[PDB]
């Protein structure tokens, strides 16, 4: 459906790392599954600095594993709060 995790990142740091760090939390092999956010694509070799938000630091990625009925596996970060006082666009 939308499988959900929540999981923290470098934001002037690249955001495809969540194949990395999000290796434990879905116990899923992160491959096929490129990263996005609100179901828009981001590059894993760019930052939230490239792609969205400049903050700062570390934001808090409410990101789901989108694999819709056969549809392109995204990991889309649906949530991004620096820190914990929520930053926004």
């Not at 923290?8 to 999000?22: Q, S, V």
């Not at 599954?33 to 939230?48: K, N």
């Not at 938000?53 to 620096?82: A, F, H």
């Amino acid at each position: 459906m939308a499988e959900c995790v929540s999981q923290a990142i470098d934001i002037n740091e690249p955001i495809g790392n969540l194949k990395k760090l999000l290796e434990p939390r879905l116990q899923c092999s992160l491959d096929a599954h490129e990263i996005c956010l609100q179901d828009i694509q981001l590059d894993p070799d760019r930052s939230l600095f490239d792609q969205g938000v400049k903050t700062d630091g570390t934001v808090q990625l409410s990101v789901q594993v989108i694999s819709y009925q056969g549809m392109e596996p995204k990991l889309n970060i649906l949530e991004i709060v620096k820190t914990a006082e929520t930053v926004e666009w």
